[PDB]
Design a protein around this motif. Structure first.
Motif, short mmCIF file in Angstrom:
data_model
loop_
_atom_site.label_atom_id
_atom_site.label_comp_id
_atom_site.label_asym_id
_atom_site.label_seq_id
_atom_site.Cartn_x
_atom_site.Cartn_y
_atom_site.Cartn_z
N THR A 13 35.69 10.49 55.17
CA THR A 13 35.74 9.04 55.07
C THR A 13 36.80 8.45 55.98
O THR A 13 37.96 8.85 55.95
CB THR A 13 35.88 8.54 53.62
OG1 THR A 13 34.76 7.70 53.30
CG2 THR A 13 37.16 7.73 53.45
N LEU A 14 36.40 7.48 56.79
CA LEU A 14 37.30 6.84 57.72
C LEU A 14 37.99 5.62 57.10
O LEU A 14 39.18 5.39 57.34
CB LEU A 14 36.55 6.47 59.00
CG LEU A 14 36.24 7.68 59.88
CD1 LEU A 14 35.66 7.27 61.21
CD2 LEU A 14 37.51 8.50 60.07
N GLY A 15 37.25 4.87 56.30
CA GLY A 15 37.76 3.68 55.65
C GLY A 15 36.68 2.97 54.86
O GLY A 15 35.66 3.58 54.52
N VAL A 30 31.47 10.41 66.13
CA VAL A 30 31.24 8.97 66.11
C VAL A 30 31.61 8.46 64.73
O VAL A 30 31.70 9.25 63.77
CB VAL A 30 29.78 8.60 66.45
CG1 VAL A 30 29.43 9.01 67.88
CG2 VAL A 30 28.81 9.24 65.44
N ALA A 31 31.82 7.15 64.64
CA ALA A 31 32.10 6.51 63.36
C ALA A 31 30.79 5.83 62.95
O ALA A 31 30.11 5.20 63.76
CB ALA A 31 33.23 5.46 63.50
N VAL A 32 30.38 6.02 61.71
CA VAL A 32 29.13 5.43 61.27
C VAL A 32 29.49 4.53 60.12
O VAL A 32 30.04 4.99 59.13
CB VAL A 32 28.13 6.54 60.78
CG1 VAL A 32 26.92 5.90 60.11
CG2 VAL A 32 27.71 7.44 61.94
N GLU A 122 45.10 -3.93 60.76
CA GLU A 122 44.12 -3.05 60.11
C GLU A 122 42.85 -2.96 60.94
O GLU A 122 42.12 -1.99 60.84
CB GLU A 122 43.78 -3.55 58.68
CG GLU A 122 45.01 -3.59 57.75
CD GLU A 122 45.72 -4.94 57.76
OE1 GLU A 122 45.89 -5.56 58.84
OE2 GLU A 122 46.16 -5.37 56.67
N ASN A 123 42.56 -4.00 61.72
CA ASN A 123 41.30 -4.06 62.51
C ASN A 123 41.49 -3.65 63.96
O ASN A 123 40.57 -3.75 64.77
CB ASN A 123 40.69 -5.46 62.45
CG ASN A 123 40.00 -5.75 61.13
OD1 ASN A 123 39.55 -4.83 60.46
ND2 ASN A 123 39.94 -7.01 60.74
N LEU A 124 42.71 -3.24 64.30
CA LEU A 124 43.00 -2.83 65.67
C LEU A 124 43.16 -1.30 65.64
O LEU A 124 44.11 -0.78 65.05
CB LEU A 124 44.28 -3.51 66.16
CG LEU A 124 44.20 -5.05 66.11
CD1 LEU A 124 45.51 -5.71 66.55
CD2 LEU A 124 43.02 -5.51 66.99
N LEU A 125 42.22 -0.60 66.25
CA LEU A 125 42.21 0.87 66.23
C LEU A 125 42.75 1.48 67.52
O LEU A 125 42.90 0.78 68.53
CB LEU A 125 40.82 1.44 65.87
CG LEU A 125 40.17 0.81 64.63
CD1 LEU A 125 38.70 1.31 64.44
CD2 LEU A 125 41.00 1.07 63.39
N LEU A 126 43.13 2.75 67.43
CA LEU A 126 43.73 3.44 68.56
C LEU A 126 42.89 4.69 68.91
O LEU A 126 42.52 5.44 68.02
CB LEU A 126 45.13 3.90 68.16
CG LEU A 126 46.38 3.03 68.31
CD1 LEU A 126 46.12 1.70 68.97
CD2 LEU A 126 47.14 2.89 67.01
N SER A 135 38.19 -3.89 66.41
CA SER A 135 37.03 -3.50 65.65
C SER A 135 36.62 -4.49 64.56
O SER A 135 37.43 -5.32 64.09
CB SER A 135 37.27 -2.14 64.99
OG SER A 135 38.00 -2.31 63.79
N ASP A 136 35.39 -4.29 64.09
CA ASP A 136 34.82 -5.02 62.97
C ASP A 136 34.38 -6.43 63.33
O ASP A 136 35.19 -7.33 63.39
CB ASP A 136 35.79 -5.04 61.79
CG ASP A 136 35.09 -5.35 60.47
OD1 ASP A 136 33.96 -5.87 60.54
OD2 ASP A 136 35.66 -5.08 59.39
N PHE A 137 33.08 -6.62 63.51
CA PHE A 137 32.56 -7.92 63.89
C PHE A 137 31.78 -8.64 62.80
O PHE A 137 31.01 -9.56 63.07
CB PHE A 137 31.83 -7.82 65.23
CG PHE A 137 32.76 -7.53 66.38
CD1 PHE A 137 33.16 -6.21 66.66
CD2 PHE A 137 33.34 -8.57 67.10
CE1 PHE A 137 34.12 -5.95 67.65
CE2 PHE A 137 34.26 -8.30 68.14
CZ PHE A 137 34.65 -6.98 68.41
#
Ligand SMILES: CN1[C@@H]2CC[C@H]1C[C@@H](OC(=O)c1c[nH]c3ncccc13)C2
Length: 268
Positions: A13-15, A30-32, A122-126, A135-137
């Protein structure tokens, strides 16, 4: 041709939820994003317009039955949120670099007429090399189409990051709102704390900032050069607020602070 290439194993689990998927054959990760539909259509639509090095890439989507699967760029470095030390922040050079990247992704989104509306750490990934990706639209929207700007009126985002006009006015321009939230992200990166619960006169910390009490907490830990940039971003009147082309001309924005990513070397 290659048989099992279409198979991915969900490994952690990524989040709904986000899972890290690993290709059975290639081992590509990949992230799904898994959305239990029982919004998404606009989110998929917006993601399909996106192609930029500082924006989370969209690979495609699958509907199955009631469950939507969005395949996204995997960012192994985690959230910017986790690089911020409480009450401390992070070294200034790192913050400047993440800030340059954030501006590049934002300029890009604004160029295609898209506003994110929920910029926060939280919405800025590295990625693996610490490259920042927005991220997250899910809350994003189209603010310009056929060259005509449309004013926003929906209230959304996250209180500590939201621009004061969202709380005060019925309608507002999209762009200064995203700029404002990038200024709060910058404050968080340099001070390791958020300046206020929300940008309202009823909020003591916000009223102290407007009265320029920079000898107080978050501000006192900053440093004059980036603090002068924050004075131009966190301006209550969105019409007077600095715009991005101008942020790009700011003194701190252009100050040399950071050495490039170190590469292996020997002596003789
Ligand atoms: C606050 N959220 C959590 C984390 C970021 C933002 C949106 C969502 O993650 C993604 O969309 C990810 C795409 N690629 C990723 N790579 C590693 C971790 C999360 C994502 C859930």
């Amino acid at each position: 041709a290659v048989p099992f290439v279409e198979d991915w194993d969900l490994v952690q689990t990524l989040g709904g939820e986000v899972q890290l998927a690993v290709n059975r054959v290639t081992e590509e990760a990949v992230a799904v994003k898994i959305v239990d539909m029982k919004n998404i259509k606009k989110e998929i639509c917006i993601n399909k317009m996106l192609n930029h090095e500082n924006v989370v890439k969209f690979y495609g989507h699958r509907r199955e039955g009631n469950i939507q699967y969005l395949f996204l760029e995997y960012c192994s470095g985690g959230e910017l949120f986790d690089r911020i030390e409480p009450d401390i922040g992070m070294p200034e050079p790192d913050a400047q670099r993440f800030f340059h990247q954030l501006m590049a992704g934002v300029v890009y989104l604004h160029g295609i007429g898209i506003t994110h509306r929920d910029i926060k750490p939280e919405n800025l990934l590295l990625d693996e090399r610490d490259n920042l990706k927005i991220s997250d639209f899910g809350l994003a929207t189209v603010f310009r189409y056929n060259n005509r700007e449309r004013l926003l009126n929906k209230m959304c985002g996250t209180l500590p990051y939201v621009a004061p006009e969202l709380l005060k006015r019925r309608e507002f321009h999209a762009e200064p709102v995203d700029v404002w939230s990038c200024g709060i992200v910058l404050t968080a990166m340099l001070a390791g704390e958020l300046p206020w619960d929300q940008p309202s006169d009823s909020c003591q910390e916000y009223s102290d900032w407007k009265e320029k009490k920079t000898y107080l907490n978050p501000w006192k830990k900053i440093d004059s050069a980036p603090l002068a940039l924050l004075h131009k971003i966190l301006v209550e009147n969105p019409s007077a607020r600095i715009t991005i082309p101008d942020i790009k001309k700011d003194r701190w924005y252009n100050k040399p602070l950071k050495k490039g990513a170190k590469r292996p070397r020997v002596t003789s």
